[PDB]
């Protein structure tokens, strides 16, 4: 299979650029030059690149340096045809953010965190980015008495409302995507799941400008069903971006290649995003890989892993397509009544009174007889896996 | 410490009445008589009792029978001075509900599920219940291709909108509390965390009427911080009811006595609910125990475990109070800047233009210096634990 | 593909016979007649059937009744040609076993548990069973102070030594396989992982007669790597039997069809078992399916699910074979140095004195140069998955 | 309370010396001087200090320097009276160990790893250490096809056999303690639980020289019951050392102060270690704290956290003794038949023949009457907790 710009595969500069310094060891790889990253990615089929302010411009660079770096980066995008669909800000690495950015108990840190983001919004706008991703990695706590969650949510809200105000006033037209994570690096992070992030966004001043950027491994760290979570995000129309990667359940954040973790869920996910209503994808944004080339690899291993992500997505798509197109699957879908859930429970114009008067819905209903019919779910499931396995 | 009606301890009929028939063994206790249960609960200090329709009136009882049971039940209530703060409907036991009640693939079951709940609403209304708890235990799936999540949410919403319609027309004054659970009995259940349920509720026709009924153990099954999720629920003003119990992380639902699983989180939870805003509780509803007396116990064990629930709460409350009243704690709270989070990040009348003009929030900000000061959070945590252990 | 008797696929009478009564609901299926189960299994390609004493003969059957059942049973076996490779005893259903069988705190229960087992060994020996599986589902605790573990291990060992004795004296020639499980139905089960069971077995009077019966989902309930634990069981030579099924990480025991849980781990498990050293399988006992047809299915779904287990195993076996015969996979293996681990670290005849003498092992070792070479693990993992996907 | 040298509280240099560089951010604390560490710890009550070669002497220090550091370190011990009970080797930080030390696919790395340990054994022997802790943090894999587990166990064994040989020949008198961990930093680590580690040790050439060093957080990362695992380790007589800390279930390794994670299990653990048979502790080695002062803390928080470890153990000890001494507890233990588990199942001289002859153990046994009696476990648990809360 071959990747096209229409596939919209994007990679964070911090992904292929991860030097592999983990919590227990030193880096095993040298630093990647942003310009080189741009050329390599272009080469493997990516349509865009993303970055944290500090990934491109070293924290504390003078404007002369800063400016120089932006200029070169800009050239590279130019020559290669790559776009910058999203930008984000690093509010977790520097020691000042040890208790968070937007929700640090220290007031001065909160003012500083907003400034850092405003600045990144400026660069984003200049490069044509449409989405600002906010990953509140340090917002949370290790101890319950150390953080007033209520106050914290008020402060998270206060900061986001200002950001939307500014973007709207400067006419940047950005969309904001809150990225949920349950833990790591804080004992517990605020807005731990896709659900909590969506509920929170609904309380902002201009909620229509806000959505979520769910990550495969983040939901899997709590042993949740990522596909089902995305389905809910789509129902709400809050899926503004997505970070794809792999994880093996509740343990540290692994960031494996997409599909190298829960393979069955990777399959149902591609199916959900691609076999949307009327042939068309249910999702239109970037298919962004927020992963890390394993610590045991060298740059060869790095480019390999970059391509594996694209490969995995395209192989899965291909099988998801075939699954749905199979008349035997179509038949099994019918038997399991999957589409019958789309029919309203109530007849047209029917209310409580008409339902209360319908004896077939209760008084004359044979629950025992209906309770005995099988749904044929194992069989439908087995058909899906045989398609995944290329055995059908 | 002794329980008062003011404490508002309530228990489900199904908790003390659980016969301890589990997934791998027969019942070890005989059935508990409801009148008996009312009488025993009144005696241990409970102010109220709750029940699923099928816990009181056996599935399929003729009207004569059903009518007789209610009459006896009401009399017991009468005599003991116990109220019915909440009622719920069993939409999970009978085989007809094997693929869900409101979201079953089968349209006829969905219709029947609504009828079963309307009927329970009438009875709750009759007994003076204020809350209708909805636990969608069979809503979800074992395989991703078996359930269209989107359509399922539409149907869950279609059903709730109708229930609210009816309650409102009839003047019942009920409040609806959705109860989230990540799994069990289904592989994955729709609306798995407190967050997912709050986000969903914000999408119904009369949202003001809807909230959640989170359960200690259900959030812990995903390894989430229960106190922290309750904090967010209170922030959204959607904590309509609470189910208290104990659990040991992600494994089957244990339903232990409150405080017998994660004790530290049980402590921070009581602190949150009781050491509210004024001096007053932050939550005013029933303190409901949704637990199960261990299968190894007889009826002496059952009554002991009921009392243990009340005892754990009162003991934790007492230590939470003492913690907050301690001068050394006040000092640790001041050093950790807990209260500083409550001060707006921005000065009154400050917007992005003023923030951008503040050189001190960025250009002249000494992040290195700020990042070197400690928050003293361990010390604060240590004082909290010492209060819990009665060591101070 | 089609299963042959050489494949050695076996099923427990309790798998296809599960009536689907779970922790939250009634059975959805009627009971399966054992003779009918024998015929249906033979028909789908199973070579054997296994059972708990109470699956075949209802608890408390008089001797005439029990004898009658056993005889009809044997006739079915005879006519179909199916064998009984393993038998087991139910020490978890009856209320008497609420605190365990061999380790109940109650002495009389421990004496009864041993007699229930001895009686099953006789029947096993008469049906030709070669393995007795021991699953101590009720040995454990919900509270730490309720059970003396040391005393419990002593009692466990005391019971197992007697069983080996009787078997050896009767010339039964049975091998014993302890089945580990972390929790469910007890909060914590004794001998929680394959590791704990192996270490325990090593302390018996006649260790050579004892091994383990690990189950896919049981190790996954603790989020452990099943293939890797099986690899270690094989290194100790204690894999006496195996239970294959599917699970989705830490949650109640799902008992899905094999391969329907962690697909990638199922794949590597089949590779380990069949692509053993010397062309041949690394394991030669039964490939036993200890699973449950989902509660949503009827008898058609039950047989579909039985056949899905065998199809899953054969498909994965085919892909594991092709994987290994791929010259590109071989080249990747060589590049990743997998086989180089099989070469002793020390030279023949080298001891610490000679090692200490080798400056190339330390003094002149360039750690930094070695440290920079990639292992090519990602690329290898990618080829593995492409084989599973039928993309190669 | 106050710590005495008889409490044997020890700490690793890497604990209070952790600079707080995590997977997502820079160090928030400067480096701690080892002599100072010796002094500081002596002051808070520790009786000993431990370290990794590389904690003390910077990786790649010339002989002169190394010698220099050791001599200063020896003086500080001298001056303060602290001992070095255990020493360990760093086989996880340097890039050369990315695929492991002892089981690296690369043979040259395995040879180098052995040399690096021999050298630490010498320094350990010279400082009077009695235990060599072996933590194979990089032993494992991210991908199943990348590591031959059987070969890795052979190589692990091969390296340990040699270390034992050396120690015995040099007359060092060291005992070896293998430390199990399920994951982090490798996706899956070899010897993931205390169980797997004990089983392994039993296969070595001089097993009497090997035991384990289980860590509270490591077992909790897999959601296992720490106390129960230590109870099994003591049964086997393999508890050579112990690492105490706190953790909040399956997530990244938190390394909190002991008792700051699962409080109830920290209580039962202290009870098991101290309320041993013959009044005396069941365990007499060092109570070693392998924890990390939270990243939000400065050097004051660091010493605060060090003291917290000691305070937690002593407060728990105090409650564990009060618990056992309480007459009501004594009455609950009796009703729970906790001690009846210590009486053999069989009468002295009884074997299967006499057991079979006992109609009362089977034919005339009333399983139903026995099954109806409760064990009073909930009451017993409640008393334990009230003792922990200082409520009794
Ligand atoms: O787990 C870390 C996050 O996934 C991070 O990469 C964000 O997506 C960007 O700040
Ligand atoms: O986990 C089971 C649920 O908690 C149930 O008891 C609801 O609260 C009422 O249906
Ligand atoms: O989880 C229950 C066990 O897996 C059981 O089926 C045993 O294998 C036999 O008693
Ligand atoms: O989790 C890492 C280990 O706990 C480490 O600190 C060892 O005990 C010493 O190598
Ligand atoms: Mg991530
Ligand atoms: Mg991300
Ligand atoms: Mg529950
Ligand atoms: Mg509940
Ligand atoms: Mg099982
Ligand atoms: Mg099994
Ligand atoms: Mg650790
Ligand atoms: Mg350790």
Coordinates of N, CA, C and O in Angstrom, one line a residue, chain A residues 92-216:
Chain A
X92 N 5.3 21.1 30.6 CA 5.6 20.0 31.4 C 7.1 19.7 31.7 O 7.4 19.3 32.8
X93 N 8.0 20.0 30.8 CA 9.4 19.8 31.0 C 10.2 20.6 32.0 O 10.8 20.0 32.9
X94 N 10.1 21.9 31.9 CA 10.8 22.8 32.8 C 10.4 22.7 34.2 O 9.1 22.7 34.5
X95 N 11.3 22.7 35.1 CA 11.0 22.6 36.6 C 10.0 23.5 37.1 O 9.3 23.2 38.1
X96 N 9.8 24.7 36.5 CA 8.8 25.6 36.9 C 7.4 25.0 36.9 O 6.5 25.4 37.7
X97 N 7.2 24.1 35.9 CA 5.9 23.5 35.7 C 5.8 22.2 36.6 O 4.8 21.5 36.2
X98 N 6.5 22.0 37.6 CA 6.4 20.8 38.4 C 5.1 20.6 39.0 O 4.7 19.4 39.3
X99 N 4.3 21.6 39.2 CA 2.9 21.4 39.8 C 1.9 21.8 38.7 O 0.7 22.0 39.1
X100 N 2.3 22.0 37.5 CA 1.4 22.3 36.4 C 1.7 23.7 35.8 O 2.6 24.4 36.3
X101 N 0.9 24.0 34.7 CA 1.1 25.2 34.0 C -0.1 26.1 34.5 O 0.0 26.9 35.5
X102 N -1.2 25.9 33.8 CA -2.5 26.6 34.0 C -3.0 26.4 35.4 O -3.8 27.2 35.9
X103 N -2.7 25.2 36.1 CA -3.3 25.0 37.4 C -2.2 24.8 38.5 O -2.5 24.2 39.6
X104 N -1.0 25.4 38.3 CA 0.0 25.4 39.3 C -0.6 26.1 40.5 O -1.4 27.1 40.4
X105 N -0.3 25.7 41.7 CA -0.8 26.4 42.9 C -0.2 27.8 43.0 O -0.7 28.7 43.5
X106 N 1.0 27.9 42.4 CA 1.7 29.2 42.4 C 1.1 30.1 41.3 O 1.2 29.7 40.1
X107 N 0.6 31.2 41.7 CA 0.0 32.2 40.8 C 0.8 32.7 39.6 O 0.4 32.8 38.5
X108 N 2.1 33.0 39.9 CA 3.1 33.5 38.9 C 3.3 32.4 37.8 O 3.5 32.8 36.7
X109 N 3.3 31.2 38.2 CA 3.5 30.1 37.2 C 2.3 30.1 36.3 O 2.5 29.9 35.0
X110 N 1.1 30.3 36.8 CA -0.1 30.3 35.9 C 0.0 31.5 34.9 O -0.4 31.2 33.8
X111 N 0.4 32.7 35.3 CA 0.5 33.8 34.4 C 1.5 33.5 33.3 O 1.3 33.7 32.1
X112 N 2.7 33.0 33.7 CA 3.7 32.6 32.8 C 3.3 31.5 31.8 O 3.6 31.6 30.6
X113 N 2.6 30.5 32.3 CA 2.1 29.4 31.4 C 1.2 30.0 30.3 O 1.3 29.5 29.1
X114 N 0.3 30.9 30.6 CA -0.5 31.5 29.5 C 0.3 32.3 28.5 O 0.1 32.1 27.3
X115 N 1.3 33.1 28.9 CA 2.1 33.8 28.1 C 2.8 32.9 27.1 O 2.9 33.1 25.9
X116 N 3.4 31.8 27.6 CA 4.1 30.8 26.8 C 3.2 30.3 25.7 O 3.7 30.2 24.6
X117 N 2.0 30.0 26.0 CA 1.0 29.5 25.0 C 0.6 30.6 24.0 O 0.5 30.3 22.8
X118 N 0.4 31.8 24.5 CA 0.0 32.9 23.6 C 1.0 33.0 22.5 O 0.8 33.1 21.2
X119 N 2.3 33.0 22.9 CA 3.4 33.1 22.0 C 3.4 32.0 21.0 O 3.6 32.3 19.8
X120 N 3.1 30.8 21.4 CA 3.1 29.6 20.5 C 1.9 29.7 19.5 O 2.0 29.3 18.4
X121 N 0.8 30.3 20.0 CA -0.4 30.6 19.2 C 0.0 31.5 18.0 O -0.4 31.3 16.8
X122 N 0.9 32.4 18.3 CA 1.4 33.4 17.3 C 2.1 32.6 16.2 O 1.8 32.8 15.0
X123 N 3.1 31.8 16.5 CA 3.8 31.0 15.6 C 2.9 30.1 14.8 O 3.1 29.9 13.6
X124 N 2.0 29.4 15.5 CA 1.1 28.5 14.9 C 0.3 29.1 13.7 O 0.2 28.6 12.6
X125 N -0.2 30.3 14.0 CA -1.0 31.2 13.1 C -0.2 31.5 11.9 O -0.7 31.4 10.8
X126 N 1.1 31.9 12.1 CA 2.0 32.3 11.0 C 2.3 31.1 10.1 O 2.5 31.2 8.9
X127 N 2.4 29.9 10.7 CA 2.7 28.6 9.9 C 1.4 28.0 9.3 O 1.5 27.0 8.6
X128 N 0.2 28.5 9.5 CA -1.1 28.0 9.0 C -1.8 26.9 9.8 O -2.7 26.3 9.3
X129 N -1.3 26.6 11.0 CA -1.9 25.6 11.9 C -3.3 25.9 12.2 O -3.7 27.1 12.3
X130 N -4.2 24.9 12.2 CA -5.6 25.1 12.5 C -6.0 24.6 13.9 O -7.1 25.0 14.3
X131 N -5.2 23.8 14.5 CA -5.5 23.3 15.8 C -4.4 23.5 16.8 O -3.3 23.3 16.5
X132 N -4.8 23.9 18.0 CA -3.8 24.1 19.1 C -4.2 22.9 20.1 O -5.4 22.8 20.5
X133 N -3.2 22.1 20.3 CA -3.4 20.9 21.2 C -2.9 21.3 22.6 O -1.8 21.9 22.7
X134 N -3.7 21.0 23.6 CA -3.3 21.4 25.0 C -3.2 20.1 25.8 O -4.3 19.4 26.0
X135 N -2.0 19.7 26.1 CA -1.8 18.4 26.9 C -1.4 18.9 28.3 O -0.2 19.4 28.5
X136 N -2.3 18.8 29.3 CA -2.0 19.3 30.7 C -1.3 18.2 31.5 O -1.9 17.8 32.5
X137 N -0.2 17.8 31.0 CA 0.6 16.7 31.7 C 0.9 16.9 33.1 O 1.1 15.8 33.8
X138 N 1.1 18.1 33.5 CA 1.5 18.3 34.9 C 0.3 18.8 35.7 O 0.5 19.2 36.9
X139 N -0.9 18.9 35.1 CA -2.0 19.4 35.9 C -2.6 18.2 36.7 O -3.1 17.3 36.1
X140 N -2.5 18.2 38.0 CA -3.0 17.1 38.8 C -2.3 17.0 40.1 O -2.0 18.1 40.7
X141 N -2.0 15.8 40.6 CA -1.4 15.7 41.9 C -0.9 14.3 42.2 O -1.4 13.3 41.6
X142 N -0.1 14.2 43.3 CA 0.3 12.9 43.8 C -0.4 12.6 45.1 O -0.6 11.4 45.5
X143 N -0.9 13.6 45.8 CA -1.6 13.6 47.1 C -2.9 14.3 47.0 O -3.0 15.5 46.5
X144 N -4.0 13.8 47.5 CA -5.3 14.4 47.5 C -5.4 15.8 48.2 O -6.1 16.7 47.6
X145 N -4.8 16.0 49.3 CA -4.9 17.3 50.0 C -4.1 18.4 49.3 O -4.3 19.6 49.7
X146 N -3.2 18.1 48.4 CA -2.4 19.1 47.7 C -3.0 20.0 46.6 O -2.5 21.0 46.2
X147 N -4.1 19.5 46.1 CA -4.8 20.2 45.0 C -6.3 20.3 45.2 O -7.0 19.3 45.3
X148 N -6.8 21.5 45.1 CA -8.2 21.8 45.2 C -8.7 21.6 43.7 O -8.5 22.5 42.9
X149 N -9.3 20.5 43.4 CA -9.8 20.2 42.0 C -10.7 21.3 41.5 O -10.7 21.6 40.3
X150 N -11.6 21.7 42.3 CA -12.6 22.7 42.0 C -11.9 24.0 41.5 O -12.2 24.5 40.4
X151 N -11.0 24.5 42.3 CA -10.3 25.7 42.1 C -9.5 25.5 40.8 O -9.3 26.4 39.9
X152 N -8.9 24.3 40.7 CA -8.1 23.9 39.5 C -8.9 24.0 38.3 O -8.4 24.6 37.3
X153 N -10.1 23.5 38.3 CA -11.0 23.5 37.1 C -11.4 25.0 36.7 O -11.4 25.3 35.6
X154 N -11.6 25.8 37.7 CA -11.9 27.2 37.5 C -10.7 27.9 36.8 O -10.9 28.7 35.9
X155 N -9.4 27.6 37.3 CA -8.2 28.2 36.7 C -7.9 27.6 35.3 O -7.3 28.4 34.5
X156 N -8.3 26.4 35.0 CA -8.1 25.8 33.7 C -9.0 26.5 32.7 O -8.7 26.9 31.6
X157 N -10.2 26.8 33.1 CA -11.3 27.4 32.4 C -10.9 28.9 32.2 O -11.0 29.4 31.0
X158 N -10.5 29.6 33.2 CA -10.0 31.0 33.1 C -9.0 31.2 32.0 O -9.1 32.1 31.2
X159 N -8.0 30.3 32.0 CA -6.9 30.3 31.0 C -7.4 30.0 29.6 O -7.0 30.8 28.6
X160 N -8.2 29.0 29.5 CA -8.7 28.6 28.1 C -9.6 29.7 27.5 O -9.5 30.0 26.3
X161 N -10.5 30.3 28.4 CA -11.4 31.4 27.9 C -10.6 32.6 27.3 O -11.0 33.1 26.3
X162 N -9.4 32.9 27.9 CA -8.6 34.0 27.5 C -8.0 33.6 26.1 O -7.9 34.5 25.2
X163 N -7.5 32.4 26.0 CA -6.9 31.9 24.7 C -7.9 32.0 23.5 O -7.5 32.4 22.4
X164 N -9.1 31.6 23.7 CA -10.2 31.7 22.7 C -10.5 33.2 22.4 O -10.7 33.5 21.2
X165 N -10.5 34.0 23.4 CA -10.7 35.5 23.2 C -9.7 36.0 22.3 O -10.0 36.6 21.2
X166 N -8.4 35.8 22.6 CA -7.3 36.2 21.8 C -7.3 35.7 20.4 O -7.1 36.5 19.4
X167 N -7.5 34.4 20.2 CA -7.5 33.8 18.8 C -8.6 34.5 18.0 O -8.4 34.8 16.8
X168 N -9.8 34.6 18.6 CA -11.0 35.1 17.9 C -10.7 36.6 17.6 O -11.1 36.9 16.4
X169 N -10.1 37.3 18.4 CA -9.8 38.7 18.2 C -8.7 38.9 17.2 O -8.8 39.8 16.4
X170 N -7.7 38.1 17.2 CA -6.6 38.2 16.2 C -7.0 37.6 14.9 O -6.3 37.6 14.0
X171 N -8.2 37.0 14.9 CA -8.7 36.3 13.8 C -7.9 35.1 13.4 O -7.9 34.8 12.1
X172 N -7.3 34.3 14.3 CA -6.5 33.1 13.9 C -7.3 31.9 13.5 O -6.8 31.0 12.8
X173 N -8.6 31.9 13.8 CA -9.5 30.8 13.5 C -9.0 29.4 14.0 O -9.3 28.4 13.3
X174 N -8.3 29.4 15.2 CA -7.9 28.1 15.7 C -9.0 27.3 16.4 O -10.0 27.9 16.8
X175 N -8.8 26.0 16.5 CA -9.7 25.1 17.2 C -8.8 24.6 18.3 O -7.6 24.5 18.1
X176 N -9.3 24.4 19.5 CA -8.6 23.9 20.7 C -8.9 22.5 21.0 O -10.1 22.2 21.1
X177 N -7.9 21.7 21.2 CA -8.1 20.3 21.5 C -7.4 19.9 22.8 O -6.1 19.9 22.8
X178 N -8.2 19.6 23.8 CA -7.7 19.2 25.1 C -7.4 17.7 25.1 O -8.2 16.9 24.6
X179 N -6.2 17.4 25.5 CA -5.7 16.0 25.5 C -5.8 15.3 26.9 O -5.0 15.8 27.7
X180 N -6.7 14.4 27.0 CA -6.9 13.7 28.3 C -5.8 12.6 28.5 O -5.3 12.0 27.5
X181 N -5.4 12.4 29.7 CA -4.4 11.4 30.1 C -4.7 11.1 31.6 O -4.9 12.1 32.4
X182 N -4.8 9.8 32.0 CA -5.1 9.5 33.4 C -4.0 9.7 34.4 O -4.4 10.1 35.6
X183 N -2.8 9.4 34.0 CA -1.7 9.6 34.9 C -0.4 9.6 34.1 O -0.4 9.3 32.9
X184 N 0.7 9.9 34.7 CA 2.1 10.0 34.2 C 2.2 11.2 33.3 O 1.7 11.3 32.1
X185 N 3.0 12.2 33.7 CA 3.8 12.1 35.0 C 3.2 12.4 36.3 O 4.0 12.1 37.3
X186 N 2.0 13.0 36.6 CA 1.5 13.2 37.9 C 0.9 11.9 38.4 O 0.5 11.1 37.5
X187 N 0.7 11.7 39.7 CA 0.1 10.5 40.2 C -1.3 10.3 39.5 O -1.7 9.2 39.1
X188 N -2.0 11.4 39.4 CA -3.3 11.5 38.8 C -3.4 12.9 38.1 O -3.1 13.9 38.7
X189 N -3.8 12.9 36.8 CA -3.9 14.1 36.0 C -5.4 14.6 35.9 O -6.2 13.7 36.0
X190 N -5.6 15.9 35.9 CA -7.0 16.4 35.8 C -7.5 16.0 34.5 O -6.7 16.0 33.5
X191 N -8.8 15.8 34.3 CA -9.4 15.4 33.1 C -8.8 14.1 32.6 O -8.1 14.1 31.5
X192 N -8.9 13.0 33.4 CA -8.3 11.8 33.1 C -8.7 11.0 31.9 O -7.8 10.2 31.4
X193 N -9.9 11.1 31.3 CA -10.4 10.4 30.1 C -11.1 11.3 29.1 O -11.3 12.4 29.4
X194 N -11.4 10.7 27.9 CA -12.1 11.4 26.9 C -13.4 12.0 27.4 O -13.8 13.2 27.1
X195 N -14.1 11.3 28.2 CA -15.3 11.6 28.9 C -15.2 12.9 29.7 O -15.9 13.9 29.6
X196 N -14.2 12.9 30.7 CA -14.0 14.0 31.5 C -13.6 15.3 30.7 O -14.1 16.4 31.1
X197 N -12.8 15.1 29.7 CA -12.3 16.3 28.9 C -13.6 16.8 28.1 O -13.7 18.1 28.1
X198 N -14.4 16.0 27.6 CA -15.6 16.5 26.9 C -16.5 17.2 27.8 O -17.0 18.3 27.5
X199 N -16.8 16.6 29.0 CA -17.7 17.3 30.0 C -17.1 18.7 30.3 O -17.9 19.7 30.4
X200 N -15.9 18.8 30.6 CA -15.2 20.1 30.9 C -15.4 21.2 29.9 O -15.7 22.3 30.1
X201 N -15.1 20.8 28.6 CA -15.2 21.7 27.5 C -16.6 22.4 27.3 O -16.7 23.5 26.8
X202 N -17.6 21.6 27.7 CA -19.0 22.0 27.6 C -19.2 23.2 28.6 O -20.3 23.9 28.4
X203 N -18.3 23.5 29.5 CA -18.5 24.6 30.4 C -17.7 25.8 30.1 O -17.8 26.8 30.8
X204 N -17.0 25.8 28.9 CA -16.2 27.0 28.6 C -17.1 28.1 28.0 O -18.3 27.8 27.8
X205 N -16.6 29.2 27.8 CA -17.4 30.4 27.3 C -17.8 30.2 25.8 O -18.9 30.4 25.5
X206 N -16.9 29.7 25.0 CA -17.1 29.5 23.5 C -16.8 28.0 23.3 O -15.8 27.6 22.6
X207 N -17.7 27.1 23.8 CA -17.5 25.7 23.7 C -17.4 25.1 22.3 O -16.8 24.0 22.1
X208 N -17.9 25.8 21.3 CA -17.9 25.4 19.9 C -16.4 25.5 19.4 O -16.2 24.8 18.3
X209 N -15.5 26.2 20.0 CA -14.2 26.3 19.5 C -13.3 25.2 20.2 O -12.2 25.1 19.8
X210 N -13.9 24.4 21.1 CA -13.2 23.4 21.9 C -13.7 22.0 21.7 O -14.9 21.7 21.6
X211 N -12.7 21.1 21.6 CA -12.9 19.6 21.4 C -11.8 18.9 22.1 O -11.1 19.5 23.0
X212 N -11.6 17.6 21.8 CA -10.6 16.8 22.5 C -9.7 16.2 21.4 O -10.0 16.1 20.2
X213 N -8.5 15.8 21.8 CA -7.4 15.1 21.1 C -7.1 13.8 21.9 O -6.2 13.9 22.7
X214 N -7.9 12.8 21.8 CA -7.7 11.6 22.5 C -6.5 10.8 22.0 O -6.4 10.9 20.8
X215 N -5.8 10.1 22.9 CA -4.7 9.3 22.4 C -4.9 7.8 22.7 O -5.4 7.5 23.8
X216 N -4.7 6.9 21.8 CA -4.9 5.5 21.9 C -4.5 4.9 23.3 O -5.3 4.4 24.1

